[PDB]
Every structure is written in structure tokens, then in C-alpha cells.
């Protein structure tokens, strides 16, 4: 999917997304109170949006991929 622009420009957003989240958990050792929770709910509104956004994209080669993510039909409930 390196040449397929739409998927490569959507998963890319998922890539740097985890950098922010993983840093958020590592940049402290206490509960998410000092505007961390305020920053936490920011990404889920975009991530889960980016999550189901990808879901419509796959609905030739994606059959081998979407099968693994959909083994428990969880995205079917999304």
C-alpha cells in the first residue's frame, strides 16, 4: 500500500498518532489530570473517526488484510 495514496495518507495519520499517545503516558507517572485527559479525549475523537474511516476504504489485495482485523466482527459493530 505504499503506492496507494488514500490508504497511505490515512494510516500515516495513525502512525504519528501513537507517538503522541505513547509520549503522553511516558511523559508522566501520575493520573491524567493536568490537562492530559483534556488532551486524551482529543485523539479518540479523531482516532476512532480515523478507525472507521479506514473501514469504508477497504469495503484485490485488501482481502488478505481486512480479514485479520475482522476476525471477531468488532468493526462490524463500528
Amino acid at each position: 500500500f505504499i503506492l496507494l495514496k488514500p490508504v497511505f495518507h490515512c494510516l500515516n495519520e495513525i502512525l504519528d498518532l501513537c507517538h503522541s499517545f505513547c509520549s503522553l503516558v511516558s511523559q508522566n507517572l501520575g493520573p491524567l489530570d493536568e490537562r492530559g485527559a483534556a488532551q486524551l479525549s482529543i485523539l479518540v475523537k479523531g482516532f476512532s473517526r480515523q478507525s472507521s474511516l479506514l473501514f469504508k476504504i477497504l469495503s484485490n489485495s485488501d482481502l488478505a488484510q481486512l480479514l485479520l482485523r475482522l476476525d471477531y466482527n468488532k468493526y462490524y459493530t463500528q
Binding site: 488478505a64 480479514l67 485479520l68 482485523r69 476476525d71 471477531y72 468488532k74 468493526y75
Partner: protein
Amino acid sequence: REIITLQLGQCGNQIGFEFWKQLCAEHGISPEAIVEEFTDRKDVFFYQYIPRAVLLRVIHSILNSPYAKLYGNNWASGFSQGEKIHEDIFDIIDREADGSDSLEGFVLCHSIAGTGSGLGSYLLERLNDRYPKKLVQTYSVFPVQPYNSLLTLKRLTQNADCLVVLDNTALNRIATDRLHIQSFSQINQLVSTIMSASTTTLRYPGYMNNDLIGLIASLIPTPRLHFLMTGYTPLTTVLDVMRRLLQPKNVMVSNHCYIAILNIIQGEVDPTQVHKSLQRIRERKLANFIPWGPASIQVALSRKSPYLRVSGLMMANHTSISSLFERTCRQYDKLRKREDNFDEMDTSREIVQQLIDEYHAATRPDYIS
């Protein structure tokens, strides 16, 4: 990233010695701890060769083996002696830690039945105290006997960040069926095949699964559900393998559904059909799963030792393991009515009951919250 092993009690020391036997023979390392002439990255389990083992009557039998160059019964009786020689053994661990480049985990091999039960309980607490940054995987073995087992659980439920179960009663049944033994030295042979195959992807260089964290992190979703069970088919396409794994006659255990599944393929199978087997397997809907959490089935390839045909092992985190705990708790309650404070057993009785509920609650459509 190196991982050191710890062997306690009779069972632990016996299987670990054999665990190395299968391991050293898997590589070209003669019993006298030297490479034979006759690829396989050996950094995780060997130092330059010498294995990173820490062993604790039976040592005479091992020192009399050709491998001389390769290096009470109550829970209260075991825990008491361990505190006395605390600083004695922790010298060994410390000197082995800094001698290692970057220590990663602590494999523990012991039986929950007697000195290994208490000493292991003492270790796990102290190990977490000094080292809070180290994974702790344990190869515990299941069978006054019930009291020793329940006390270990209280420690294993919160200290060990990972765990595998190996029950003898189920293992012994495999012996009379397919091996016709009626012997510990024989039933242990399967354990070595189980243990060695459990960590195949760590020694052979691959794309992923290059660390113990790379394996367990997929299975355990929450630090409360940190128990696994095993499966091993060869006792020949990939579909032939995955089908024979999920049969209840092969697993090593004595509504309910899986949480995550790992598949270890040690053969030379053609990797183009592997995604096809999952398709057909998913359609057959041969195995049920949780409805709350999105997960899948993990499959990973490997290569068999050329110095030694397709095998296969499966790692399972099944909520049916809660049934086993009930038997221990059910028996103990019978003992509590059959006969310095006797409250430590009572607190553990509570904390083990919590784990049974957590599994039972996990099979619900609304386990979360």
C-alpha cells in the same frame, strides 16, 4: 536483551536441566559446553558458551551427569528459610544482572506443590521489590497439598506479569493414551518439547517476535487476565495443523471463550496458503471469542534445527482455566471444616476468589466496567 532462568524444587530443577538438554542439542553445543563444528542467534540464553542459569540432593545427580561443565514441605517451612538466606542468593542474581548487557526478564520453573512453592512465593515478592522494571514469566506446574497451592496463587495473581500452566493429571492422561507408560522422567520429555517450542521465535532471527515482550503483550489485555494454556499437535498443510490444535484432545488442560490465540509453526510450510487457512478456519467458526474486545488469532513461523517434517504449537488464553482454580478452592473449603493467626490463608482465599469472578465476568458482553 538477555533472559535468565531460575529453577527451584525437584520438578523445576529436573525439567530445566532437560530444558537445557533439548536446548543445547538444538544448537551445536556439546555437553561439555563447547560449540561443535557441524545462523541461530544464541545471545538470549547463552553467554560467552555458558547458559544463564541459577539453580537452587538432586544437584548431585546433575553434577554426576556428563554436563558437569555447563555451569520442609509446608509453605511456611519454605518461606522461612528463604528469608534467612535472602542476601546469599540475591548476590547471584545481582552479579548475573550487571554481567548481562540489558537484562529483560526472569523465567521461573517450579511446581506449586514443596520448597519451590514457598521459596518462589518469597522470590516473586522480593524480585518485584528490588526490580520493578523486569518482566516475570513463570512455568508453574499444577498437581495439606491444597494449602500450599492456594498460598502460591496469592503471589502469582499480582506479581508474575505472565504465566503458563502445566497440569500433570492432564499430562499423565496423554501418557497412557499415546505413550503407554502405565514415570516423571517420561512425562517431563513432553514438557521440554513444550518449553523449547514455547520460545522458538526468540533464538532464530526473524522479522518480529524478537523479545519476550513481543510475544506476551498480544495475549494479556489487562494485568488481571495473565494466564495461558498450551497446545501442541505433532505427537501436512497449515490447515491440517490449525485444525488439530483446537481439538480438545490435544490441549494440556483438564459460557466460555478465548481471548487471544498464538500459533507457532516450526516447519518449512509454504507461506502463501497461511492466510487461506485462517479464511476457511474463520468461516468454520470452529472457535468462539469475546464479543467486547477486538482481537484475532496469531500465527508465526520458524525454522527447525538442521542439526537435529512440520510441527506446531499454540498459545491460548482461555477463560475455561477458571474452572481449575475452583477445584483448589472447593477442596480447601472442605479442609477448613476438617482441620500464629491463620489470616494470611484467609486473605489469599479472598484474592483468589476475585480472579474467578474476573474470568467469569470476562465472558459477558459487558465485561468492561
